Amino acid sequence: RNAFYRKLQNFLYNVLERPRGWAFIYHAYVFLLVFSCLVLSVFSTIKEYEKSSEGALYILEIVTIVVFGVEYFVRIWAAGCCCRYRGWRGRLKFARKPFCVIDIMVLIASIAVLASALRSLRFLQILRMIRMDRRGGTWKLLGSVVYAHSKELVTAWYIGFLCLILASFLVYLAEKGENDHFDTYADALWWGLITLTTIGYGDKYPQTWNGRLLAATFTLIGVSFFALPAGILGSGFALKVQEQHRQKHFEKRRNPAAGLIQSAWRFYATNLSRTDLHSTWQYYERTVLKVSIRAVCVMRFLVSKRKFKESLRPYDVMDVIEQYSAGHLDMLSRIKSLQSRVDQIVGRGPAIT
Amino acid sequence: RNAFYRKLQNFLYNVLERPRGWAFIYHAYVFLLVFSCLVLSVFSTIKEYEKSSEGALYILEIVTIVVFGVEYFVRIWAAGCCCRYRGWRGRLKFARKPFCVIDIMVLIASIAVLASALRSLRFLQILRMIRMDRRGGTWKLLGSVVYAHSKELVTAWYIGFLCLILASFLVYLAEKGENDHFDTYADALWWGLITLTTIGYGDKYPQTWNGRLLAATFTLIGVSFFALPAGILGSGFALKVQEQHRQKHFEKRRNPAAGLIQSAWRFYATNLSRTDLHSTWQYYERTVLKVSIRAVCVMRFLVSKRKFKESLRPYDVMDVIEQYSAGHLDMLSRIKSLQSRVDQIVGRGPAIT
Amino acid sequence: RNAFYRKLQNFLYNVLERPRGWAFIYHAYVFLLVFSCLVLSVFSTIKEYEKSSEGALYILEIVTIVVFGVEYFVRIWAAGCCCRYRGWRGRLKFARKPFCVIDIMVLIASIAVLASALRSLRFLQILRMIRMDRRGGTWKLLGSVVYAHSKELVTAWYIGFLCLILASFLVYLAEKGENDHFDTYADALWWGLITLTTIGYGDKYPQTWNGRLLAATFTLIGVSFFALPAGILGSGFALKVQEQHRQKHFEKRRNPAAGLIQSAWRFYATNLSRTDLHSTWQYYERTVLKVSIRAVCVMRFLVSKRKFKESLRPYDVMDVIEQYSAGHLDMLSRIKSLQSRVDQIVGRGPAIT
Amino acid sequence: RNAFYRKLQNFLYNVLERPRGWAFIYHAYVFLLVFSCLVLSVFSTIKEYEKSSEGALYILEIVTIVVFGVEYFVRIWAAGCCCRYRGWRGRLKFARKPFCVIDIMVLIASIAVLASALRSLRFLQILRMIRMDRRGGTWKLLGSVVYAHSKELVTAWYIGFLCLILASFLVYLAEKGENDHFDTYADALWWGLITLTTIGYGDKYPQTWNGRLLAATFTLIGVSFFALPAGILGSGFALKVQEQHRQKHFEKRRNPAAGLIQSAWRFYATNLSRTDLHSTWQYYERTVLKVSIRAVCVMRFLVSKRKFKESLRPYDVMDVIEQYSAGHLDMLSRIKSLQSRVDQIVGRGPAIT
Amino acid sequence: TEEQIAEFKEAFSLFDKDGDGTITTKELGTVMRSLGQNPTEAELQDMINEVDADGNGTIDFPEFLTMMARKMKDTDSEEEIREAFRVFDKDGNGYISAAELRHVMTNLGEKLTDEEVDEMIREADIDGDGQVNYEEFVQMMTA
Amino acid sequence: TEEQIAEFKEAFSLFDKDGDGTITTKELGTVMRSLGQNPTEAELQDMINEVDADGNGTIDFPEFLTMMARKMKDTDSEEEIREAFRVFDKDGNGYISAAELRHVMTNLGEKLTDEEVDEMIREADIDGDGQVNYEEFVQMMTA
Amino acid sequence: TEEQIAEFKEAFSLFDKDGDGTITTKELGTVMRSLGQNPTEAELQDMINEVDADGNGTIDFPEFLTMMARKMKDTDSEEEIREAFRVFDKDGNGYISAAELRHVMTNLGEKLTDEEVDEMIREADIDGDGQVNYEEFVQMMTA
Amino acid sequence: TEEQIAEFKEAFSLFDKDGDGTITTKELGTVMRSLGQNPTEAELQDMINEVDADGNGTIDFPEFLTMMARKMKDTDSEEEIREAFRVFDKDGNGYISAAELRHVMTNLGEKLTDEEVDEMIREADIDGDGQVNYEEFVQMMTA
């Protein structure tokens, strides 16, 4: 009634916020719904299928709006579990985040429309689509990758832009009068962009032969340089996600490390024969036979050591390098101690002799 | 007559199933045959070359169907070698696998057709083509790569989809009235897809100048983002195949390791001067002079050690790191033992002095 | 008045030359200005928007030219801070660099124009755009990447060129008479280039079926090979920037290393109880209580050790490998010394016994 | 006269065969010549520029043929330096290599033509272009990369081929009657190829809306899969060239290693105080004061050690890992020896006590 | 010795309510529930399975007494605790601050009681400086 | 000693049917075939080639006696056997379970006989616990 | 000892003008300014924060005396100085040339005075060869 | 000692034809040319520059005598020679075959004379087995 309700609130906060596995399945289903709504709107734009598309889209839009309303209700209801956002005042405070601001803006726009509208509806659809993330993870990753590879990307942009401008200008000179496509330098720039991107619509293409030679040379260079950024971004994406996985693995290390320290200290302060361990003993007592407490504490220490060793997996060359290099320094200290002790032995040697 | 027949059955199971080298050459030849059948069917679709294509395709189709029949016969015949599928009942049990189900479905469809048919024939050709794998290796690799890089791929999909929708909508607004290509938002979406994929058919392209500017900006962004997935998938393919090779190398390690343990224990239990080694001695006796048995056992141990060391090749930095770090821990234990023994020496030092 | 003026000169040399962060923001703003000038010139090329574009471009061009003049003034004024370019004669010497030569050439061309001109104006715009780098960093990176991967790039170029020539020739033979697109081999080469680059304008495409088959085979091969260079260049860009970052990190190491050596020697030569440390003592005296000097020197040593350890971060597997392998050799020397000392012990053993 | 002529023959073998640096500059110039000949032939194909192109191409072709003749003369003349190809009979034997066979075939074809010819001339130009490699390095690298990544490439080919066939068939069904582009399944296959390759000529494109939806889905999937191979091949190229560089570095190691062993043995067998070193002493004598010989031998040993240490650079993490792990095993043996010696000490301890 | 074995009898009688001589997974879970903590069934099963020497799904008495007598020194977990402390010394100077320690632990894993960390500092902050070395901590703990 | 050398004479006479003083590859294959196992010709050739000191394609008697007298300690294969056991301890705890061992071996490489693994546990499971350390196994084996 | 503690009193009185018993960040900056060098406020704050044991933002007298008595041996910075010299021996032969050293230092970081490097070579170039080993330098420095 | 110093005088008089007390690069090249080998000028310059302690471009007599007296043990090049042998043992078994050695060397770098490799095997193939360990080779060489 009370604990069960709080547990359900936490579970619905889990699903409504940062879903995992099945929660992600629910989010995928709601995304499916909204995407089907968008596709049916696009179909309703067409005149031929307007009637059937509208007939099948009215009900889907009603379903989408009711789902959005209940989802927002549950979101604000479950925002109260967090201590930072505890209480109704804390729930209201939670709405000041940029994404809550975006969601409320979309909600006010949608209710205003519900209470020339096709353009506004399309903009609202785009905004609600942008609302699907709620974490900024995609944009954060994109920005981090761009900033990390800023040098390569800027080099590609600079060289490709120079190539585009120069090629467009030279082909414009080659074909200003002969070809109707290139009657202006802006047309030549449009052609150069469409060519170096390899889109090649075909609306504009060189027809003179000096123009075709210039186009060939500069299209080789420029298609290479325009394809550069995509590969740079792909490599950056891979690297950044790998770094994020490494950091997550190290945090998963950090937690069991604290667990192991806790359980080891508990065992040290739970020795049956020992004394002056009142804190841990009384601790177990309040949590609640001394031998049983010692046995359970030893068992906890063993399982915690198992967990810590499990988390100590390499995951990387540098990881094991550092792990074993700590021991290498330990061994260097040990061998220095052995050297000092042999020095003691040799100093004492004259005493015996 | 008996052993030779079983050996031939196993060899034909090897070639018919998971072919290697030459078996792969036979599978390549049968794939060639079926692909030539498909190409000749495509040619027979054309009206100009229908007569000659059909004339040369009838015999090829007959050859393909007879080859398929004999291949299925041999497949079910050789399915009996495996213990899990021993006996005719085991052979029938073997057919419950999903790929055997697909093959039997194709066979029933083909016999039904043999006993408006061009569409069904084309679908059957596609299904038989899908049948060529028989291991799911390609699909398994694709799925594993997609799941492994799910974050990067989803980021690319989300950003590219937002870019496509926004660019299509803005160019539609720019050219709703001026350009006949973009008379509907669905046309604008089609143009945006064809542009961001860099296909650029040319059936639709912006002609206004605000439309062209929007197209330029968003095509830069969107062509980059649409080219992303391909590079992500390529990198994932490379990484996953490398991981598979690493796992195969480690299994090839595991086998000679068992071999070495076996031969080392045999040598330990075959010492001529030693006694109470009745198991290994009697073992050699039953396999079948004691000195000869000892010599052969030593020779087996030597060759097994050679094989194990051969399998112990690095293949990777982390591999040698772990291999030598095991020895590093061994050396740390040794130096700790030396420390303890020096402690014994210093404790005894007062006794002599 | 004097030190403040020199400090301002150095700050403006920092911003005017090799800007960082905010200096880069100013450079981005001036680049924006010049790019807007170029875009407005392109717009003024069009006849429809010539009047408004010129009206809004006159003032922007005036702003750009005045900004360029003041920037060159400040550049030559601040060139005097550097010792190599100290004095007005040193300032004049500074102008002999290739990029200063380019800038002065652009300036003389622009003043000549200011004192049939659209072509010259466009060329001047391209040259001023090329002037934006001032370090050659983009071109240096491109050249280094191309040279580093010269083997892969040359292999791709050779194979792709052979594929282009062969495919163009074979499709020309297939369609010399049937198709008006391929009435000459030069047309076939143009088609082959536009196809293998995947631009595919559509002005030329095979229409015969032997031509289409040849096109299909060779377009598979050639599109793969033409897409090769872009990926090769992207990987090279990433690798080269990583190498540059590694070198920068190692230089950032080198500096605190000198700092640590300096402070450690200062501490060794500042011991209060010690003597014959007149240089460091008198050094502190001139910089300017002996105990205070010793305390500050110890504090400097501690902070310098902290900085050196901070700079000693791995940044790479090979880095820590070398760092700890130096200690591994040290430990090998230590254990050899222990071996020799145990040899001394055993040699002395007979003496006691 | 004799040694100088042999030196010149070896230098011209170096330049004519496997050129380096400047030799590569000469090969680049001859390639330029032949490429200009090909370009001028292409220009002569055009009717408009036939007269001037032929006028300027006759002399260039004469230059090319004379250069080819003299180059072949020098090639066969310098083939005699190699011991395997010493003598005129050895020179003739040298011509049995596949590339010499190709060159002689081209030569006989060219002389036959010199003694309807435009097709043969174009084929001869293609063959002479293929002749430019002479090492098979490009083809060898391509084949090695394809075989190394055979799994990924085959997965990409299989999935992309299935996608192409399925998409083409489904769009053909969608547009068999509505669109004139897809009146046959072969047309649909051509469209599918041109689309998934992202060439997109525009001659064929879906116009129905079910066709457009199918096209959109399958073009997403198939453009990704068709772009896969290019990235796979690029990564393979990079990896294979890196492996080749590693092998070259290790061979450059191997040579100075032999040098160091040689010089160290010479020093061991050149000690002045030592005796029974007649071989090395007499060796120096014949090459030709004993103290001078010892000094030069020590100097040679020092420089050889310097060279060997220079060649011992890491170049890779695994390289230093193995290098220092050899020393790690050495140190383990040393510490085991120390353990045994401490065992001797403890066993002797009772004797003294 | 004999008295320790008798205390083990007492402990087992407290644990093994069935009297079969083996503490079952369900019995262990129920008794632990009675001991003032609330673990999970799978947690108990996995943590006892590897603990069991014979993999019988329960702990027979010989294993119980052997593990009770199993000293911390035999485990040789000094490296494990040293690493666990090490993953918290982000600076890597070899010393870990104690206010830091207190907070980190009060918030981490099996949240310790305030008195627990107080006695932790009592035994470990012998220097009473707050910046406590962890190598000395593990070395005294193992001893 | 002399008696060992005489036993080596007996072994060689059993092996070298030709009487040339060298056990040839073909003779080794045939005698082994007579000894109750069926190897392959290339297997024999490769496994004896590196075994032969002079690379004569056969084993002369001095090599035979030297290798027979070659003790396990000289090979210093302790690391090799330790690694071979190590690649089976997936947990990495340093101990390898014995039911596991039995099965793995009965199925792996040169499939051992049941009595073979029984005597393996007899000599190696001195503790009789099933979870046998491999470092102790190799250390006793080499001794 | 007592006289050293009295000298510490003298040093603190020179430092702590306020007389609160703690040398504050601002007081340290001002006194250092009076000592003939010009550092920055953030530099001082960061360099004293970790120096302070209790993180009070200032140095109480016990920390002052402990750090003054803190010998170079206790820091165990031998590896640090050895590495700092090592990053300059590009050849890696283990010896670093002295003209090289002079120049590098006169130009690097806290630019040393000419007499400073002169006494550096005096104490370190005991061999007087210019090519001075750095391991010996650190070993004598720590001693 | 004194007689060794006199022999050094004889060696220098053989080398230094000018009589300036320093063997110049050109003089070293010419004398070596007279000694039966034909090196290159840049080779000589680079190989003597690092050899020279003071970097004077020539070798003064103190450096000459110090390097002549410089024993192989001081160089501590045992690891270098051990690696140089190691890069030839492709198997990695720790032993390198001698026919192999002969050929490899007759063809590698400073091609040794046949008698040179003969005395190499004489001193190194003490076992006379052909498969010679390289660690023992370096250990005896340094001694």
Ligand SMILES: C#CCn1nc(NC(=O)CC(C)(C)C)c2cccc(OC(F)F)c21
């Ligand atoms: C070269 C190139 C083609 N290209 N591709 C671009 N997109 C991206 O890099 C991906 C984002 C970071 C924009 C998401 C881009 C941006 C600015 C200028 C460009 O070319 C210009 F320099 F000519 C651009």
Ligand SMILES: C#CCn1nc(NC(=O)CC(C)(C)C)c2cccc(OC(F)F)c21
């Ligand atoms: C998927 C894809 C497109 N694609 N690209 C190909 N070229 C290459 O891989 C590079 C080479 C190894 C041929 C040099 C190719 C070859 C066969 C079949 C293909 O598609 C088919 F499976 F549909 C192919």
